[model samples]
Target chain A: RHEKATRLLDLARMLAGSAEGLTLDEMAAALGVGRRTAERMRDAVWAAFPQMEAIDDPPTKRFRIPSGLDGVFQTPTAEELAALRVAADSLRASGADARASSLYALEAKLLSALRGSARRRVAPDVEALVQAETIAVHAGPRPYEDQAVLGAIRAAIKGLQALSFRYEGGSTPGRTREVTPLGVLFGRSNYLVALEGKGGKPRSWRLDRMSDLKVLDKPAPPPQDFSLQAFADESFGIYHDEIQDVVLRIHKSRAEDALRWRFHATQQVTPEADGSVLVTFRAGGMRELSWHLFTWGDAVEIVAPQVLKDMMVQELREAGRAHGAW
Target chain B: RHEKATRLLDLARMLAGSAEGLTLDEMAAALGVGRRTAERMRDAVWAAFPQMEAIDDPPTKRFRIPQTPTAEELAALRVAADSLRASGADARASSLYALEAKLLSALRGSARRRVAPDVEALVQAETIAVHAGPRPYEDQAVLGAIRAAIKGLQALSFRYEGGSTPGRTREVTPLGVLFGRSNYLVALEGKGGKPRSWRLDRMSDLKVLDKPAPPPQDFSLQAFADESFGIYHDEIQDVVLRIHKSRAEDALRWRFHATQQVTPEADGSVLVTFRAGGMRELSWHLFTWGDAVEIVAPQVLKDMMVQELREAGRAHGAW
Candidate 1:
């Protein structure tokens, strides 16, 4: 098993991908070889690929294949291709047309890169995966996103400009509002996450409710180093309000589900010795969390957050009152 | 516009992927250039890739890139990384610890040197789509057992916890798995009986029995699924929605169900028609359309829409 040739081939591949050009010290770790052995293999790789670029980082040197290995070295296995096709299907399943459209175009670009004979080899296995697996779709609104409004928002974000639009969630009709465009929180309903004015806190405006957008002349860039996920993750749901340290004790019987479920992006599930799972996370939107918690029944109990318990208790009272009327 | 370089690039990858490499005739045909231009391009490719090997076929020789030149295999390789990044299936990549290795193993033997001109060309151009869909539920043991039973023509028995007789051990002839809003194992509860849906989550302690339980010879899983708007099936009826002119275009493009037809009317409205089951589900969806769509159908649909208001109407003031 002359994996000696195999080792050279691998080193050749690593050389091409190292955009910064790997040093002898870095190269040895990647190859899992000692420095001297790696130095010898580097020469062996040089023999195979002489065009490899050798750059001087002073006391140490860096080596890389000038451009990259040929496309011949990077063919897609069937699973990769299949997962893409499935992802397109999944995106479409949730009625996320913009993203689904993007996936379809990507799939198209990838397929055209392949030859007919090569495609014939790859496509059937992709078809096999297509039928083997699928995603489940739940009922929800098709989050309204059109290129005109979304294009404007995206352009403004990149442009670092304030946008002017009539906020339809208003009593005074057609009252124009000017604000800095931060980024969008795309979910069940798309929202324009933005500041109402300079140095204002972020608020969610339903994309569907926004009308007649205009990118203003005044530059209004978001504060530097704005983390979109961090903004979205701070909320238990979309409506960010008071933050609470929520701790829930899930019954041991339902702990398996609790382990798999992502209640919040910033959450931890620890199994207790008492045969129950403790789920904890810090987030705002206790009202929404309270409503969601009702679906779990007695299997879950709120261990902390007096506000959350009060909301749930008040919610049950109202529901019971309504049913009692019946 | 870099057309000449792109032409050379295309020919180079085409040459590598040819396996046996390309003769001038094949090269000319593929490049869409005449034999003379084809000859020059191959020379261009050969100059760039000095290690081009020539195979003798008596009169005419075949040229190849020793280990094969540039198939643009990197494009395919980039797709897997891109797909997993988009699908949120780092599971596939961890699973790909094996797959990416296999692809890499295939890589060493068919290796070639030289960078693609753009480096990260198509990948950078691609819009990494944020998926609107659910990540979906998948358990390896459950999928493996169900798939084995499906392929092996065997019966499956498990504790059924979702239906009327919750937590009862039941045996069924496995039909096919429905990959939908909730994944279901479509099966017959009784011998030669009607196929029914069983939730994958509710069923546990699965066993694939030796007894032969072949799927219905003519039953199509898609047709079975397409029978309803949602997964549940009942009262297949003619559903016609007269979408008002305001939102007619959206209705024309929207996929309400698999079997649907939308046509523009002379009055500017869109006539949407689909004979499907699940009126309650249709009623739920109609609320999303608001007053834009009017039910032009069987009385059951109209009544279902009213029933929603009847409950909410009675309950609000009472609250």
Candidate 2:
């Protein structure tokens, strides 16, 4: 019974954070507990505390700490209350719902009763930026759809059932195919490494644009063994092929630039007294590393690996077409 | 000339509305223009128009807009400018700004721009109730502080000063007051059919609350000289006062109350009915009438008037 009571208290706090005053029916729906259980909680709250008072505004149920009992609760000081009122009001204007009820009647009785309240404080830098209206808060990408996809992926991964997702070819519009889910490659952008449902071959999809991911309850058994990371590293930006080690060399004058950009995992800098240095890194994919070398302009040189040298020459020739004009 | 331009625009708008914004210099410094020339005239606006936009930002020494443009003007849109980009190692977090610039840049150059152009239209609504949160805005007392105070004086009168345009700024207080939701009255509380409720809205802050209300230089006005309807009337909550048919129409359904009795006056004007439940309501009744309604006494009503009304014209305007 004690365990149940503690669970009930935790549930009530969570519900309070999400909703305004709740009717018995609304409370029951939200708490996912029976009506009797809620009534019992209410009774326990009322009987256990001498200061609690239920406000009688019939047909619209509400409860509050009575006005006289405000002193007992160490209510919010006037300044704190006032700041909350101002913040709540400003948020209301901007359609921010998070701190809406921190002011007004929900906490009014407690706030009004407090004495000798100190001035309200906000982070000085944040306040300065906010007052100037410059620092903008972007709520970021919508998560509702992503969360739903993740749920389905979790279920499929656990059950080892066959699941399919609509896939799009990156190069063209109006091209799509179905693919079976395998596992996710977590990085800056999450990608789902999957086997194409039609051909039963491997491919990946940028998780952001995925839709209609459906998992079959009973399909095929799980693969004997698979490496998600190895599958992903096989490709660069969703392009995979046989891997090869590519190398690049940087002269002494431009060594810092190379160091600044970790061009590859393995890099070393050797110093020369002319206030210059040389740096190098070994990596795969001439296509991936070629554009980066072009960005360094005259400072970098491709050494070893004749294939990359040929690719760099071809890229430089293409770049010459747009040299100073359109 | 450039000095006065923006100030005049703001003064004109202030006269149209009820309040004006003032800069630190404008609030404290004296103007060369004479009071009569600067007070309540469109000419004042014309005089300042040239100087309004030229006020300099002391440090930068550039003339910026005097006050922050009203919230409306600050958020206004303009023609697109050229694109800009940031180049550096620490650029990922700032990429959102670049994205926004790209979007705007695309919008500027779309081929079919003029016809069926892609645009984002943002709309905003301003409402006071929104400040009260989800809870209802039902606090009349807090918003109506000045109205309630003036309505309780049976006979009150105060001189007027206009804030947007200044005039004789001096002491003045209430005699019998009338509480109008939009305006207020300072009626004569006691003495004779003495000066009664004067419109408080028209009267500026300096005039209503000055230590000695600076007297109107030209006019030595007597009480009730320019009396008119809508300023004051006497209709208590109950015990309707009947005016004759001649005076009846004027008092019928005055703005003071939603419910009022209009009965045939002995002289043919109508008698206005009102409940005199509270002193505040009764005071409003007496002021609204001015010379129109005579309070047939419960003797206590008349005595209540005598006890409260015998102050000098400018006595009560002090802090």
Candidate 3:
């Protein structure tokens, strides 16, 4: 059973979110309930909020809370504004310009929505945090995603049309590839995970490597069962390979730290009287796992997986040679 | 008694921080322990880490660790960097970005993943803690001209409308930008007048003059900042205050002005002295100290504060 108190607030947000209004059926599906359940939730909010306005489009009717709760509680705090701007910069650092622009636009809308009285009053606290806090950005390969390319890919995905672009690499040098754009993957090295040609399985393509992109007249749609979250989470990291059961014993000294960590989708944990933690998960990308393991220092003891051990040794050799270590 | 293992890392940081290794005396004072306790702790770290190099620098030497900061430290740096970017100091934020890169280069690859979770929570924590303050003025055009003139050692000219002037073109040698409740351009008016703060919002048509401009001899930008309670400067005066035992610790931690000097009293009170110009503003701030603070000097400030309390009493009908 849903918590009645919390669920009412959820529906209240939906009514507030809509510019026009939410119809009874639209509100029901949003909350995953029946028409009567949706009306009940809506009425509870209507009774509680002061600005519930009812109107008809003749064929159908909808409800809007207008913005009593808006002025009462929902004005952006100074810290929230700073955080919103920080989130935009955070995305820009990852080279997701398309999404970053959207976030920037949202922040601007909120900025103007804040009336002059509150805006001026909230300004000092806003400046204080901005002056005091900061985001420490680290190094990596700068993603080569261009704004135009990102814009084109997003439009093609939304428009359900295939996109054509010149892929950077092939045996024949700088060739073209036609695929229905799936979605843009954000990372240090972003990718366009799209289906290639007819009857092709989804393969991730480097976003920056493509040139002269265009959305086509031909209709395209994602596979009936294609799930990006599952596809992304199946690997230990981005690079895919043969899945293997990974086992490691976290030492007693740092075992407390291990319990709170979300290591993988299928990981199991067992703590022994030896005061150590044993975590097991099946995932691919042993090389990626090896890179992550080095940050743990000496608190981890690998129980199995020769592939990971070999990868670990190679990483140490690279690091050891760099720093004059034995 | 001490958390012996944790304290070892504490000395470990000291050894790394000082370019010249820390002496026994330096280490003892820093760790708040006796010399023998210092020697014993130093020897313990000497056994653990390989790179503990010892050298002499005449009378005293310092320890140097020279290493990568922990996740907490980097997370703090991340928080500061992100805050600066959000506040629109985008260029200044890049330096922290490069600093993070230089730090991560010393670590194993995948520095982003290592510091990721720590920074996420740290940013939220900072937002919660920093919920109070008044905002300053922000205009890139005026700030840009002020900075450009300062950078090139040139004059700054703007269409002015504040401080007994309106729609007049004013020229000055830009000293610096002072940010507070109001952002002001600290500039030398007519290359002769004492530095005055011109509000950026009041100024228009900002231009950095190409002609060479130089500040007055032996002038310090911050030194001549007209130390005050807030931004606006009044007649400079030596203000002294004494906090009773009830608020002695509070006064000790409080920062009143730039040149504030604080000392403990025998009766368990605290003495604070700072030569600044904002008596009106200072009186308003001191009201928070309640009955715990006694105005030690500046008889006018004492009278001013009394008048303020009296006015509030009559206005609110608290008489």
Candidate 4:
């Protein structure tokens, strides 16, 4: 069937993309098929490409296409280049200057790797598309502007070094702090979630408020099992507050939109008999949650988390006072 | 020489990266070596990898590595993918996502089941900012048509609603798209072949013509855009600014433009100079510096700055 051929192609690409080959279980999971199907697919791939090699990894074996596909087949499409360019622009627009430049450098390296003829063929097209596509920035306080500070923090995190910086805007201002960087989180603002000294509890520091950055030559990376993704997902936004189970109800008129929207990474949505939708997620950043709720207007109602409801009411009251409504 | 071997590997990677192949001249130019050196390297590559094929193309012959690289070579590509995704280039990250899928499927029989420890370490060590900014609205249809025209080397026609005049149908040789705070299309207009920029959001009724799009031979789009601070093009000026000693530290870290020269003074003040146009945009940026910056040169820029201040004063009821 057509699906089988597509799956085979997908399997081959996955194998070619990584040097560490895949096991039958991993292949089955990745391909969304059963172990028997994965085995059959693996057998078919072996038959098609006799050059494929199998290696024993302890209790299980892995498979891979030792030789990658030809350049003619691997040539990047215009759309792919366009998408990459968009990402670079987005990074730059978001004030991630260091990372943006790196992407630009990567693009050049990729272009140099392309076949001369293919490069010549798509150069104009890619160039044209880049020129035509533009990213219009919206209003917000610009993210951190110090590239040197960002570069130092990034290097420290990568090299597993401790970073020292003078706190400028935090509660303890004008004080130097040495910390082991767990990871960086870039959002409406940039943050360095790190542990103060070795083996200390992790904390988040705003990047803009930090100055006089120095990377200490010490092996102070986070624990081997520490996962930044899990750490970040614990909060609603960049600001970490007391995590609470929050619930909201979207009127039936906006239920469809609510279903499509991602309130949180761990959100669960259920359709109510009343035609409305109930959304629930355990998250922190009550202040940020309330701010986002303003956009939903009357179409949404806070069902739980009295703290968030109070914050929303307080914000509305202030807005009313400012407008002379009270 | 050791250098020669390194150059050979570089040349081989270049050849392997592309499908159309490279000529002796291109190889020599790219490798920064002479024709004789390039020829010898070519022979060595042909001898080492007999799978490399030579094909005739009109005036000369070209050489290429017709087959896909080995798993080891592809592994290097995954390393690149990890770095790019970590840098927060999500668009390319997703593209690499597809590429990895394709590669994995193709090499499924030979690849290891898990990511290499080194690659995984690098991927986990860094991440990009999410919720940085809203994704700008892009008309997929217009982008697709423009991309197709540029790829096919054809001309494009569209109704541009920007400028003093009303919307008018304009024909152009599409050059490239510049993505920034606002997206723009760099193109060449008819007859004179002078390069111009049109905002993508201001365009409608786009059409791709069958005629060949001949872009200016010597034009470099980056160089063209660098002539101005932002998009508004005008007479380029050598503008200078003196940052107060108090804010010089801030100024030292700031990039006014790509083509900027900064010189520090003993007093801790800094003089920044750059050749750029778009007085309006330049003036808008100077407003952010507040009183820490003083315009040092180009009477025209000073006048523009004065005018901008006057307007701001008038708006705030200071006039």
At residue A97, what lDDT does model 1 achieve?
A: 67
**Native-vs-model 2 lDDT?**
0.36
Taking the tens digit of each residue's C-alpha lDDT, what string does model 4 give over B194-254? 5677767678899999887866667666677676787667888998888778766557656
Q: What is the lDDT of residue B195 in candidate 1?
A: 63
| Model 4's DockQ score | 0.11
Interface Cα RMSD, each model: 13.4, 36.5, 30.8, 14.0
Instruction: Compose the digit string of candidate 1's lDDT tens values, residues B108-155.
Output: 321322343332433332222233223335565676577667656788
TM-scores of the candidates are 0.58, 0.28, 0.44, 0.59
Q: Which candidate leads the pack in lDDT?
A: 4
Q: Of the candidates numbered 2 and 3, which has the greater lDDT value?
A: 3
Answer with 1 or 4, whichever has the higher lDDT: 4
Clashing pairs in 1: A68-B115, A71-B72, A71-B73, A72-B71, A74-B73
Q: Once model 3 is optimally superposed onto the true structure by TM-score, how far is the C-alpha of residue B6 displaced, in angstroms?
A: 51
**Interface RMSD measured for model 1:** 13.4
Per-residue lDDT for A112-152 in model 2, tens only?
32232321322232232222111111111111224466667
Listed models, DockQ each: 0.08, 0.01, 0.01, 0.11
Could you give candidate 1's per-residue lDDT for residues A219-286 as a string of tens digits?
87777776665677677767688787889888886877777566775678789988899988898887
Report the Cα lDDT for candidate 1: 0.63
Off by over 4 Å in 3: A1-11, A18-46, A50-70, A92-98, A170-173, A317-326, B1-319
Question: Which ten-residue region of model 2 chain B has the weakest summed lDDT?
Answer: B124-133
- DockQ comparison, 3 vs 4, better candidate: 4
lDDT of 3 by residue, B64-138 (tens): 532334443454455555545444444345445434433332333244345545443333322200111122345
